[PDB]
Amino acid sequence: GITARTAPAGGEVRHLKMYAEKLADGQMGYGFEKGKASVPGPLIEVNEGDTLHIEFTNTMDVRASLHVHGLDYEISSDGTAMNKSDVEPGGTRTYTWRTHKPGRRDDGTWRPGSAGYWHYHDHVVGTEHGTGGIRNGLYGPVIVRRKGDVLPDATHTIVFNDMTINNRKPHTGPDFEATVGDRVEIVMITHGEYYHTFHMHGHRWADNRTGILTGPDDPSRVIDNKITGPADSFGFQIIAGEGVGAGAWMYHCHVQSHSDMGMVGLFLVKKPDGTIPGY
Amino acid sequence: GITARTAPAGGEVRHLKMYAEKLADGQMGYGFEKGKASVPGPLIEVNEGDTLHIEFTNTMDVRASLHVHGLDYEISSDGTAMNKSDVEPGGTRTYTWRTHKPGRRDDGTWRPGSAGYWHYHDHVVGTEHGTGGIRNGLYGPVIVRRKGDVLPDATHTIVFNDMTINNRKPHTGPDFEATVGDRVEIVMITHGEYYHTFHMHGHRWADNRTGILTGPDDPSRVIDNKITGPADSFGFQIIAGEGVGAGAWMYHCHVQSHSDMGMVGLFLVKKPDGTIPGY
Amino acid sequence: GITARTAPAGGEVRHLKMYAEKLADGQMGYGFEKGKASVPGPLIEVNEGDTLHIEFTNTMDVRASLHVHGLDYEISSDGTAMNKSDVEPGGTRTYTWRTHKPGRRDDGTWRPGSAGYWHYHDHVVGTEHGTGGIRNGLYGPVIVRRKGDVLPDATHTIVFNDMTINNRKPHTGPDFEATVGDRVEIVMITHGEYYHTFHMHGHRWADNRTGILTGPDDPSRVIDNKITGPADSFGFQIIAGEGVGAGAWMYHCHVQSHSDMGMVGLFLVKKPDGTIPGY
Numbered sequence: 001g002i003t004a005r006t007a008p009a010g011g012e013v014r015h016l017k018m019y020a021e022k023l024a025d026g027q028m029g030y031g032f033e034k035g036k037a038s039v040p041g042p043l044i045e046v047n048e049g050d051t052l053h054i055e056f057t058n059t060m061d062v063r064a065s066l067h068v069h070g071l072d073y074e075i076s077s078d079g080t081a082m083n084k085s086d087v088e089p090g091g092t093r094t095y096t097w098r099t100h101k102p103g104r105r106d107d108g109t110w111r112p113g114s115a116g117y118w119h120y121h122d123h124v125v126g127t128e129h130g131t132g133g134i135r136n137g138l139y140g141p142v143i144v145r146r147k148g149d150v151l152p153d154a155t156h157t158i159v160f161n162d163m164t165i166n167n168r169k170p171h172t173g174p175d176f177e178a179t180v181g182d183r184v185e186i187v188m189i190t191h192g193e194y195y196h197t198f199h200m201h202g203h204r205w206a207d208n209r210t211g212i213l214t215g216p217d218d219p220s221r222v223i224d225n226k227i228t229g230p231a232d233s234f235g236f237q238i239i240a241g242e243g244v245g246a247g248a249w250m251y252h253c254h255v256q257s258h259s260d261m262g263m264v265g266l267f268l269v270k271k272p273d274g275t276i277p278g279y
Numbered sequence: 280g281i282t283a284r285t286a287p288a289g290g291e292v293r294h295l296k297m298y299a300e301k302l303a304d305g306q307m308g309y310g311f312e313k314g315k316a317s318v319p320g321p322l323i324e325v326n327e328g329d330t331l332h333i334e335f336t337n338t339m340d341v342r343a344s345l346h347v348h349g350l351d352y353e354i355s356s357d358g359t360a361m362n363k364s365d366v367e368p369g370g371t372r373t374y375t376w377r378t379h380k381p382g383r384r385d386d387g388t389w390r391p392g393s394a395g396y397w398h399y400h401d402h403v404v405g406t407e408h409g410t411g412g413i414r415n416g417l418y419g420p421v422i423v424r425r426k427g428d429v430l431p432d433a434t435h436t437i438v439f440n441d442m443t444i445n446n447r448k449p450h451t452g453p454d455f456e457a458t459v460g461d462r463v464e465i466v467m468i469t470h471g472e473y474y475h476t477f478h479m480h481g482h483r484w485a486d487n488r489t490g491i492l493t494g495p496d497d498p499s500r501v502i503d504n505k506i507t508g509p510a511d512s513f514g515f516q517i518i519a520g521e522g523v524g525a526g527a528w529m530y531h532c533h534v535q536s537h538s539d540m541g542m543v544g545l546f547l548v549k550k551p552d553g554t555i556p557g558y
Numbered sequence: 559g560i561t562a563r564t565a566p567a568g569g570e571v572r573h574l575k576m577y578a579e580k581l582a583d584g585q586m587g588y589g590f591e592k593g594k595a596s597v598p599g600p601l602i603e604v605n606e607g608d609t610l611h612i613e614f615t616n617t618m619d620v621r622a623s624l625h626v627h628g629l630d631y632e633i634s635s636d637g638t639a640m641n642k643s644d645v646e647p648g649g650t651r652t653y654t655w656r657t658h659k660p661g662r663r664d665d666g667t668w669r670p671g672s673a674g675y676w677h678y679h680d681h682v683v684g685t686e687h688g689t690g691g692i693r694n695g696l697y698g699p700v701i702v703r704r705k706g707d708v709l710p711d712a713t714h715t716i717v718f719n720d721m722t723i724n725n726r727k728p729h730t731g732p733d734f735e736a737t738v739g740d741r742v743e744i745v746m747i748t749h750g751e752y753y754h755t756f757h758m759h760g761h762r763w764a765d766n767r768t769g770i771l772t773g774p775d776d777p778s779r780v781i782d783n784k785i786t787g788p789a790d791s792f793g794f795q796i797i798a799g800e801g802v803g804a805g806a807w808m809y810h811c812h813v814q815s816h817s818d819m820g821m822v823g824l825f826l827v828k829k830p831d832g833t834i835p836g837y
């Protein structure tokens with residue numbers, strides 16, 4: 001990324017409120033505001049070095065928590081019953097997530113770095129691994145950017161949760177929309193019981209941390225199809241319609257009975273005039 | 280690759296005919312000529328930069344199509360019913376696949392590049408995701424070479440399609456044959472309903488784009504066993520019998536009930552005299 | 559690794575005895591000594607270049623073998639019935655495993671190198687793919703170090719074998735223990751019928767050969783969750799409690815019904831005083 005927008009150095013303390021709430025249809029969701037919970041829950045995005053203090057309130061009548069992948073947390077923020085890190089009905093707790101930049105340890109080794117595509121979810125609704133909470137919709141994405149990472153025009157979250165996408169009914173999407181040439185970021189998370197294969201028509205990405213290649217030397221596989229299982233997370237950027245043009249470009253699980261039974265959506269890539277050939 | 284044969288720069292327009300045909304036993308296959316359809320379908324191999332105009336004829340009495348992974352195609356060549364890209368019984372359509380080399384975009388980012396191990400398959404027989412067509416044998420491999428890629432002595436295609444290899448009956452192979460020291464390329468594709476693990480005895484490869492390491496700096500895992508799911512594709516080269524000698528070297532799915540029920544074949548690596556110790 | 563301990567150049571001939579034995583409870587295990595078989599079997603660790611002559615005795619009343627992944631072996635040491643490489647009841651056979659360093663071939667290509675996280679298992683108990691032997695506990699880890707690889711304080715082996723960890727009953731661990739700051743190596747192997755997702759709380763690693771990054775240029779995904787299938791093997795090192803502190807840090811399969819039914823253990827990271835907050 002030279003003149004594309006790139007992430008700055010991180011290092012700020014940030015604060016945020018989150019709620020877990022039962023929804024009217026029986027699902028459960030997270031939100032930054034009461035009455036505005038979503039499934040998936042809202043995107044949290046930070047830079048390496050940032051600390052995030054989340055003031056979490058459980059508005060439900062059963063215990064619930066927040067567990068995160070990837071980021072640094074102490075045991076008091078693991079979100080488990082075992083470590084007394086869950087939240088009673090109506091209660092509030094502050095969870096802290098930290099992130100760090102990569103760098104050389106004293107022994108001359110290289111410490112990895114927090115950056116990546118991650119996710120948060122419940123760990124105590126229905127079972128002590130959060131099986132009911134996850135099923136009901138308590139999951140959401142987290143992005144940690146490294147300094148210099150390329151930033152997108154927009155970010156969409158796609159979760160394969162059992163045999164649904166984002167807890168939707170079969171064959172109801174979601175659909176996402178872009179214009180030819182937009183830089184679109186996809187955060188792809190899987191939950192539940194089953195393995196899946198995520199496929200996008202007309203587009204492809206690098207099987208590495210960022211989903212993009214910095215230059216000619218990266219030997220990573222370039223793919224359009226990727227096996228995933230429960231609690232896996234990856235992400236990538238694509239240039240919408242790059243080399244292929246506008247169209248109603250399908251994305252789906254490529255396990256045949258899964259696509260047949262509704263794990264399908266559309267990436268609607270428009271011309272400037274807003275039209276889509278064949279749609 | 281210094282003095283091994285390496286792929287040249289691409290950039291040619293190529294033309295080819297393909298047919299979909301029902302076979303006498305009830306399967307369905309692609310071929311470059313009528314009466315010579317195979318399962319898997321024939322290998323298509325191009326260099327990055329090439330364009331391929333495929334003049335496709337559906338000789339079957341049901342609609343059928345050709346969808347490809349990885350390569351650049353416009354929406355009119357996606358092979359779906361939705362985009363009116365399938366082919367009626369007896370009909371002909373020209374599908375176009377393009378490929379591009381990697382390079383620097385105007386924004387200073389690096390555009391990936393088409394090269395890889397890919398595949399084509401039907402998208403409309405039995406269901407609108409091609410479940411019946413895929414089951415019946417409408418799939419085949421595609422290789423896109425980058426300039427400088429090492430070329431093999433021979434290429435073999437292994438497809439895990441449900442609980443078959445290449446739609447064969449249990450325990451009937453296929454078997455492949457080589458001589459110690461041959462450079463053998465394997466294209467490995469999975470289709471259907473199930474996950475698998477591809478394993479080869481006596482040999483190993485790099486989990487990256489080419490399946491080979493260019494030099495000492497590539498940190499990719501070297502493996503002999505790899506989980507795959509529907510529509511996954513990867514490929515590699517091995518030197519037959521390198522460091523291990525001649526033998527009837529098994530390859531199989533390593534999921535235990537799958538190997539037990541017949542997802543097994545042999546890589547028959549011969550001495551110059553044509554014999555195989557233990558066989 | 560500058561001043562962390564690093565593996566030396568390999569090249570030695572080594573000798574070792576192994577036994578396969580039935581255990582009192584009906585399982586089957588390997589050991590370096592009679593009466594001391596374990597499940598998983600003992601760790602074998604060598605440097606690239608080493609040769610290992612294993613003098614194997616089958617003390618059981620059914621045929622058994624030793625098959626290895628990754629390492630160089632001739633067909634006479636593949637461990638299969640087909641190649642007459644298994645061992646009758648009460649019998650002895652010498653299996654030979656070799657390893658090689660990476661280097662430039664005559665054609666200018668780069669030959670991979672044996673180094674990695676590998677495993678050995680039976681290939682003839684119950685079926686000719688060793689399904690019964692594997693089920694009963696005939697599996698163990700193998701590590702091949704490359705010169706310069708970072709060495710750990712300790713190595714733990716975690717095997718997802720069907721719906722068990724290391725053939726243990728549900729919810730019985732195993733648990734591993736460390737002190738904050740220890741360099742812990744994990745060898746993670748999967749066997750059987752099912753796919754899994756390996757997850758560790760509070761820790762993460764690089765999805766590459768060593769599980770660690772040498773420096774800022776490696777683009778490998780940093781993860782805490784990884785899909786695996788039968789006969790897959792990977793490994794990594796983590797600094798216990800790095801950035802997160804002491805705690806009873808869970809590891810588990812993240813497939814929800816699997817964790818619910820007992821594929822869970824604890825990574826007990828202690829302060830110097832031996833205590834664990836929340837435990």
Ligand SMILES: [Cu+2]
Pocket residue numbers: 160195196197253254255258263
């Ligand atoms: Cu699926």
Ligand SMILES: [Cu+2]
Pocket residue numbers: 067069121231812
């Ligand atoms: Cu999780």
Ligand SMILES: [Cu+2]
Pocket residue numbers: 439474475476532533534537542
């Ligand atoms: Cu299989």
Ligand SMILES: [Cu+2]
Pocket residue numbers: 254346348400510
């Ligand atoms: Cu496909």
Ligand SMILES: [Cu+2]
Pocket residue numbers: 718753754755811812813816821
């Ligand atoms: Cu599992």
Ligand SMILES: [Cu+2]
Pocket residue numbers: 533625627679789
């Ligand atoms: Cu094996």
Ligand SMILES: [Ru+3]
Pocket residue numbers: 123129808810
């Ligand atoms: Ru958990």
Ligand SMILES: [Ru+3]
Pocket residue numbers: 250252402408
């Ligand atoms: Ru499709």
Ligand SMILES: [Ru+3]
Pocket residue numbers: 529531681687
């Ligand atoms: Ru085998």
